Design an enzyme around this catalytic site. Structure first.
Site, PDB file in Angstrom:
ATOM      1  N   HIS A   1      30.174  47.180  44.337  1.00 36.85           N
ATOM      2  CA  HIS A   1      28.802  47.179  43.846  1.00 36.85           C
ATOM      3  C   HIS A   1      27.977  46.326  44.783  1.00 36.85           C
ATOM      4  O   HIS A   1      27.776  45.128  44.567  1.00 36.85           O
ATOM      5  CB  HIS A   1      28.743  46.644  42.405  1.00 36.85           C
ATOM      6  CG  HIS A   1      27.372  46.673  41.791  1.00 36.85           C
ATOM      7  ND1 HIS A   1      27.170  46.909  40.448  1.00 36.85           N
ATOM      8  CD2 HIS A   1      26.144  46.455  42.321  1.00 36.85           C
ATOM      9  CE1 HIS A   1      25.877  46.834  40.179  1.00 36.85           C
ATOM     10  NE2 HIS A   1      25.233  46.560  41.298  1.00 36.85           N
TER      11      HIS A   1
ATOM     12  N   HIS B   1      31.974  42.978  42.532  1.00 39.56           N
ATOM     13  CA  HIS B   1      30.678  43.079  41.866  1.00 39.56           C
ATOM     14  C   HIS B   1      29.666  42.007  42.194  1.00 39.56           C
ATOM     15  O   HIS B   1      29.962  40.814  42.225  1.00 39.56           O
ATOM     16  CB  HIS B   1      30.836  43.145  40.346  1.00 39.56           C
ATOM     17  CG  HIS B   1      29.608  43.635  39.643  1.00 39.56           C
ATOM     18  ND1 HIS B   1      28.378  43.023  39.774  1.00 39.56           N
ATOM     19  CD2 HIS B   1      29.411  44.702  38.832  1.00 39.56           C
ATOM     20  CE1 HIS B   1      27.478  43.694  39.075  1.00 39.56           C
ATOM     21  NE2 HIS B   1      28.079  44.717  38.495  1.00 39.56           N
TER      22      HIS B   1
ATOM     23  N   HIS C   1      34.615  54.543  36.148  1.00 39.06           N
ATOM     24  CA  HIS C   1      33.732  53.398  36.212  1.00 39.06           C
ATOM     25  C   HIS C   1      33.500  52.843  34.826  1.00 39.06           C
ATOM     26  O   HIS C   1      32.370  52.644  34.387  1.00 39.06           O
ATOM     27  CB  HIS C   1      32.413  53.777  36.876  1.00 39.06           C
ATOM     28  CG  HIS C   1      31.597  52.599  37.316  1.00 39.06           C
ATOM     29  ND1 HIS C   1      30.439  52.730  38.054  1.00 39.06           N
ATOM     30  CD2 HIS C   1      31.779  51.267  37.135  1.00 39.06           C
ATOM     31  CE1 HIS C   1      29.945  51.530  38.309  1.00 39.06           C
ATOM     32  NE2 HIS C   1      30.739  50.626  37.762  1.00 39.06           N
TER      33      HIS C   1
ATOM     34  N   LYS D   1      37.734  45.178  42.358  1.00 41.51           N
ATOM     35  CA  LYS D   1      36.344  45.486  42.187  1.00 41.51           C
ATOM     36  C   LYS D   1      35.476  44.360  42.656  1.00 41.51           C
ATOM     37  O   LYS D   1      35.630  43.221  42.231  1.00 41.51           O
ATOM     38  CB  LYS D   1      35.945  45.839  40.767  1.00 41.51           C
ATOM     39  CG  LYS D   1      34.450  46.121  40.755  1.00 41.51           C
ATOM     40  CD  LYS D   1      33.896  46.518  39.420  1.00 41.51           C
ATOM     41  CE  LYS D   1      33.087  47.787  39.567  1.00 41.51           C
ATOM     42  NZ  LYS D   1      31.775  47.557  40.116  1.00 41.51           N
TER      43      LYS D   1
ATOM     44  N   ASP E   1      27.358  40.544  40.591  1.00 38.49           N
ATOM     45  CA  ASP E   1      27.273  39.391  39.719  1.00 38.49           C
ATOM     46  C   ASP E   1      28.305  38.332  40.014  1.00 38.49           C
ATOM     47  O   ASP E   1      28.125  37.163  39.663  1.00 38.49           O
ATOM     48  CB  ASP E   1      27.350  39.843  38.260  1.00 38.49           C
ATOM     49  CG  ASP E   1      26.118  40.632  37.842  1.00 38.49           C
ATOM     50  OD1 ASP E   1      25.780  41.600  38.553  1.00 38.49           O
ATOM     51  OD2 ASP E   1      25.486  40.286  36.819  1.00 38.49           O
TER      52      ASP E   1
ATOM     53  N   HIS F   1      33.520  50.131  31.891  1.00 35.29           N
ATOM     54  CA  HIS F   1      33.349  48.707  31.601  1.00 35.29           C
ATOM     55  C   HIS F   1      33.962  48.460  30.232  1.00 35.29           C
ATOM     56  O   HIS F   1      33.315  48.727  29.216  1.00 35.29           O
ATOM     57  CB  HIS F   1      31.851  48.320  31.550  1.00 35.29           C
ATOM     58  CG  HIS F   1      31.163  48.276  32.885  1.00 35.29           C
ATOM     59  ND1 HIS F   1      30.800  47.093  33.497  1.00 35.29           N
ATOM     60  CD2 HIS F   1      30.762  49.266  33.719  1.00 35.29           C
ATOM     61  CE1 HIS F   1      30.211  47.357  34.650  1.00 35.29           C
ATOM     62  NE2 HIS F   1      30.178  48.668  34.810  1.00 35.29           N
TER      63      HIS F   1
ATOM     64  N   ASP G   1      30.041  54.110  33.713  1.00 32.48           N
ATOM     65  CA  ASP G   1      29.605  52.718  33.590  1.00 32.48           C
ATOM     66  C   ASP G   1      29.455  52.324  32.151  1.00 32.48           C
ATOM     67  O   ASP G   1      28.639  51.477  31.800  1.00 32.48           O
ATOM     68  CB  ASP G   1      28.271  52.502  34.303  1.00 32.48           C
ATOM     69  CG  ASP G   1      28.440  52.190  35.769  1.00 32.48           C
ATOM     70  OD1 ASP G   1      28.661  50.999  36.084  1.00 32.48           O
ATOM     71  OD2 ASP G   1      28.356  53.132  36.596  1.00 32.48           O
TER      72      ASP G   1
ATOM     73  N   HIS H   1      22.800  42.295  34.256  1.00 33.83           N
ATOM     74  CA  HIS H   1      22.845  41.198  35.216  1.00 33.83           C
ATOM     75  C   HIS H   1      22.278  39.922  34.641  1.00 33.83           C
ATOM     76  O   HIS H   1      21.931  39.003  35.386  1.00 33.83           O
ATOM     77  CB  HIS H   1      22.046  41.547  36.483  1.00 33.83           C
ATOM     78  CG  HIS H   1      22.660  42.621  37.330  1.00 33.83           C
ATOM     79  ND1 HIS H   1      22.882  43.903  36.872  1.00 33.83           N
ATOM     80  CD2 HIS H   1      23.063  42.610  38.622  1.00 33.83           C
ATOM     81  CE1 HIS H   1      23.395  44.633  37.845  1.00 33.83           C
ATOM     82  NE2 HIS H   1      23.514  43.872  38.918  1.00 33.83           N
TER      83      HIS H   1
ATOM     84  N   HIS I   1      27.591  53.755  41.766  1.00 35.19           N
ATOM     85  CA  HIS I   1      26.142  53.965  41.703  1.00 35.19           C
ATOM     86  C   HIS I   1      25.513  53.934  43.061  1.00 35.19           C
ATOM     87  O   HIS I   1      24.413  53.409  43.253  1.00 35.19           O
ATOM     88  CB  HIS I   1      25.457  52.946  40.772  1.00 35.19           C
ATOM     89  CG  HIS I   1      26.064  51.577  40.805  1.00 35.19           C
ATOM     90  ND1 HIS I   1      26.165  50.832  41.961  1.00 35.19           N
ATOM     91  CD2 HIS I   1      26.621  50.826  39.823  1.00 35.19           C
ATOM     92  CE1 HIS I   1      26.764  49.685  41.693  1.00 35.19           C
ATOM     93  NE2 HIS I   1      27.052  49.654  40.404  1.00 35.19           N
TER      94      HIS I   1
ATOM     95  N   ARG J   1      14.207  48.558  42.693  1.00 35.86           N
ATOM     96  CA  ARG J   1      15.553  49.118  42.683  1.00 35.86           C
ATOM     97  C   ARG J   1      15.627  50.473  42.007  1.00 35.86           C
ATOM     98  O   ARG J   1      16.483  51.297  42.337  1.00 35.86           O
ATOM     99  CB  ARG J   1      16.512  48.139  41.995  1.00 35.86           C
ATOM    100  CG  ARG J   1      17.767  48.783  41.422  1.00 35.86           C
ATOM    101  CD  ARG J   1      18.756  47.744  40.934  1.00 35.86           C
ATOM    102  NE  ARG J   1      19.704  48.304  39.975  1.00 35.86           N
ATOM    103  CZ  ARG J   1      20.773  47.658  39.522  1.00 35.86           C
ATOM    104  NH1 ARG J   1      21.034  46.428  39.950  1.00 35.86           N
ATOM    105  NH2 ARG J   1      21.575  48.234  38.636  1.00 35.86           N
TER     106      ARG J   1
HETATM  107 NI    NI Z   1      28.967  48.897  36.705  1.00 35.22          NI
HETATM  108 NI    NI Z   2      27.689  48.311  38.302  1.00 34.96          NI
END
Ligand code: NI
Ligand code: NI
Lengths: 569, 238, 79
Positions: free
Chosen positions: A248, A221, A136, A219, A223, A138, A362, A322, A274, A338
């Site tokens: 995600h 996501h 994971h 992926k 966002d 980034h 991450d 985010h 996650h 959250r």
């Molecule tokens: Ni992530």
């Molecule tokens: Ni994430």
């Protein structure tokens, strides 16, 4: 046939059968299950030692003559925590057993023959384990690679294109162009790499090109818009191209709830990130997803293990991921709804029950790229404390539990992204990505990281000194980390499609390049040890996490193993 | 006389037979081959003369060699002798079953299995289900077949059978005569539980949610016992 | 009443609904070519008063609250 005392023997060759080792400063006790040696014939290198001409080293080697021998190594792998000699040839695990010189040794298979050409690496006293595989990642900054590497991580699967926002939020290298760049950049590094594409698109066409362009998967996501449409589209193409897919979950629940998301996945294979929740996703349920068959549950990183300061930490992070600018109203409402100390708690337990299977990181996005392995272990040590040994445990040790937490960042992630054939565990045939661990520092500070059967980086001291031991002793790059050498010791993974289309030549990759396979045929049951399925619920009110009926929640800790005891910072 | 390779095959066999008969004649216990041939060769002539029928030769062949004629072991060995010969009505397959018997104690490759029983599908909680064939034709369902998707005639609770297979010996099956009613035994499908194919009802992972769809489709497709559509909420993929 | 429209608010931001909460959002029509594709797979076409029929129909079958009903829906050759 004289006889010696274990006291001695061990200090000479290392813990043998029946013996037990304490993993680092944790209360996790490992026990040597088996041993392939032949007491009296064990391999030792040195002054007047054994590994010498005509002796332990054959003057008539087999036409398989090993490239490198790791003598007397305690192997802790999902396949067993045993003792034996590990042999390397052509950048791979050529053999795992006795080995030496058939001319003078009773049980040495040409598989493990030692000859003039094989180098000697002592391993007695150490614990050899496969390299970890953080999946994971980034790709925010090339500096993570080296750090993660120093951890015990040889393979990094993620998406991204550098410190750009899209990357800071999601692990996605969008488009085939950006794909080119990273693959081309990857050449630079010492750490197997694989990139994910933007599953966020309901344009089949646009979805297939990225894979044909080197991506080992997709992926989805938040966002970018994790909608059932995108989710479905991505999923299907993923099927056609036999590649993995990460997700995600839709937090804001705008399109729908996990009910919907799961309904979208239509039972197809899906690697969830996650899952717990804090890392992100369908509030509050989501974590409940980790109980379904078709799902590949994975835990983030910070929310592990569970300490007094965890919850107090996250509150921020959301902002720096985010683009949740610390001010706006709508933002300053969910970001708070959250970070449930509830879901965070059960996690650890879920990890113990086999409810969770992988431990991501991450990197730079709510996770420490250098703390995957460490935490995975702490979290284990912890659970043992509060729950004690395990029912499946046999003998006075924690082997089973060990093999559970271990394959969480080795064999299970490797399978998650169809690369379990090459790497992910210390088994003959696979790529020689190994790391020697000095028992005392297990789970936090490795001795050396050998990549593709050759040392890439290890603890090294005063380069000017009369020996490698003297301080300063930090990690220093090693030969297989330089020149063309790096090219030979690393693998940049891609898809069949790309592999066949000749992505390697296409992009002038000098790095080794293999294709990912068998990604749609796997399920939760395909997760070593952590293969437990179980209908779980989550009270919308109390937020309490239930499994099969009973309630699961770990107790927050006030201190953890593998910490301040080892790093000045 | 355009001799077909098939014919030569026989002309050869025939004499393989003649030797055989000619040997015991001289008083010698016939072996595997010798028996086989002989038996076979006979039928071939018998079919030639065009008298005896297939049904008959199939039986009469069992009267060609006495348990005292062949060697010890031969009897057990020849489980049966298959041989096609040309009858006035055309070539036919005369299958002579167990032409000789255990007048001896020897049995080549005999089996000494250790008494006791094997438990099929260990720990797999079974379940009974009423099953009646409301159709005019018979229906045999198999071991590892997704029961839920069986012929749209076997009336029963599909719902209770979702993701399960007739708890029986791997391979075998269950028969249903038009009308017949029974209660089959069916355990859950192991492995990854990935149903794909059959009647196209699932084609996914055996999920309690995937189930909804199967149950829905079977309803529309007409499989008896497929409950009903109590205001079905469609999903984004199915 | 909402077909082909977006919450008339600052580009980027959003609106929150607590379980139970009831409000009256503000929503203008979608500009550009008005080509809806994705989301929940309800449109995936051009925002047409006729495309609308389908969306309204699908949402009905898919269960979205407020998605009117199927008053003897005449199916089309593509949907
Ligand atoms: Ni992530
Ligand atoms: Ni994430």
């Amino acid at each position: 046939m004289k006889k010696i005392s274990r006291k001695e023997y061990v200090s000479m060759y290392g813990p043998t059968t029946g013996d037990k080792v304490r993993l680092g400063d944790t209360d996790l006790i490992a026990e040597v299950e088996h041993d392939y040696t032949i007491y009296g014939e064990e391999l030792k290198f040195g002054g007047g030692k054994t590994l010498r001409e005509g002796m332990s080293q054959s003057n008539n080697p087999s036409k398989e003559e090993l490239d490198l021998i790791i003598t007397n190594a305690l192997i802790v792998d999902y396949t067993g925590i045993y003792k034996a000699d590990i042999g390397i040839k052509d950048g791979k695990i050529a053999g795992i057993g006795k080995g030496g010189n058939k001319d003078m040794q009773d049980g040495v298979k040409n598989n493990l023959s030692v000859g003039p050409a094989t180098e000697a690496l002592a391993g007695e006293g150490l614990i050899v384990t496969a390299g970890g595989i953080d999946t994971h990642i980034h790709f925010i900054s090339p500096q993570q690679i080296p750090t993660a590497f120093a951890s015990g991580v040889t393979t990094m699967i993620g998406g991204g294109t550098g410190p750009a926002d899209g990357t800071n939020a999601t692990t996605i290298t969008p488009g085939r162009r950006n794909l080119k760049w990273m693959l081309r950049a990857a050449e630079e590094y010492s750490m197997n790499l694989g990139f994910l594409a933007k599953g966020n698109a309901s344009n089949d066409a646009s979805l297939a090109d990225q894979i044909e362009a080197g991506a080992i998967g997709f992926k989805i996501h938040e966002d970018w818009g994790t909608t059932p449409s995108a989710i479905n589209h991505a999923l299907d193409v993923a099927d056609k191209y036999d590649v993995q897919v990460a997700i995600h979950t839709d937090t804001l629940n705008e399109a729908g709830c996990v009910e919907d998301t799961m309904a979208a996945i239509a039972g197809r294979t899906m690697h969830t990130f996650h899952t717990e929740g804090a890392g992100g996703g369908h509030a509050p349920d989501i974590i409940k997803v980790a109980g379904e068959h078709n799902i590949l549950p994975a835990s983030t990183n910070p929310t592990i293990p569970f300490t007094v300061n965890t919850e107090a930490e996250h509150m921020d992070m959301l902002m720096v991921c985010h683009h949740l600018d610390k001010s706006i109203k709508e933002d300053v409402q969910f970001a708070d709804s959250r970070i449930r100390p509830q879901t965070i708690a059960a996690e650890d337990t879920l990890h113990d029950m086999g409810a969770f299977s992988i431990t991501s990181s991450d990197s730079q996005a709510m996770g420490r790229v250098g703390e995957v392995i460490t935490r995975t272990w702490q979290t284990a040590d912890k659970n043992k404390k509060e729950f004690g040994r395990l029912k499946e445990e046999k003998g006075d040790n924690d082997n089973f539990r060990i093999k559970r937490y271990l394959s969480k960042y080795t064999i299970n992630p490797a399978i998650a992204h169809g690369i379990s054939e090459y790497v992910g565990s210390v088994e003959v045939g696979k790529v020689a990505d190994l790391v020697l661990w000095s028992p005392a520092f297990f789970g936090v500070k490795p001795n050396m990281i050998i990549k593709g059967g050759f040392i890439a980086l290890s603890q090294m001291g005063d380069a000017n000194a009369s020996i490698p031991t003297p301080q300063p002793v930090y990690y220093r790059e090693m030969f297989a980390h330089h020149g063309k050498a790096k090219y030979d010791a690393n693998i940049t993974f891609v898809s069949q499609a790309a592999y066949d289309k000749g992505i390697k030549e296409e992009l002038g990759l000098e790095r080794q390049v293999l294709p990912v396979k068998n990604c749609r045929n796997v399920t939760k049951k395909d997760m070593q040890f952590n293969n437990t399925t179980a209908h779980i619920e989550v009270n919308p009110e109390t937020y309490h996490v239930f499994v099969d009926g009973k309630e699961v929640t770990s107790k927050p800790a006030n201190k953890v193993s593998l910490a301040q005891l080892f790093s000045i910072f | 006389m355009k001799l077909t390779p098939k014919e030569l095959d026989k002309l050869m066999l025939h004499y393989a037979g003649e030797l055989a008969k000619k040997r015991k004649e001289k008083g010698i216990k016939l072996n595997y081959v010798e028996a086989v041939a002989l038996i076979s060769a006979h039928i071939m002539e018998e079919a030639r003369a065009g008298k005896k029928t297939a049904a008959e030769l199939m039986q009469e062949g069992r009267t060609l060699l006495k348990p005292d004629d062949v060697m010890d072991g031969v009897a057990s060995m020849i489980h049966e002798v298959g041989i096609e010969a040309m009858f006035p009505d055309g070539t036919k397959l005369v299958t002579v079953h167990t032409p000789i018997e255990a007048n001896g104690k020897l049995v080549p490759g005999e089996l000494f299995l250790k008494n006791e029983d094997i438990t099929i599908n260990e720990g797999k909680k079974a379940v009974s289900v009423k099953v009646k064939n409301v159709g005019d034709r018979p229906v045999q369902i198999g071991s590892h077949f997704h029961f839920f998707e069986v012929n749209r005639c076997l009336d029963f609770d599909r719902e209770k059978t979702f993701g399960k297979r007739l708890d029986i010996a791997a391979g075998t099956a269950v028969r249903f005569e038009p009308g017949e009613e029974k209660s089959v035994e069916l355990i859950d499908i192991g492995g990854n539980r990935r149903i794909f194919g059959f009647n196209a009802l699932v084609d996914r992972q055996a999920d309690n949610e995937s189930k909804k769809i199967a149950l829905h489709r079977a309803k529309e497709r007409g499989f008896h016992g497929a409950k009903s559509d109590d205001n079905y909420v469609k999903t984004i993929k199915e």
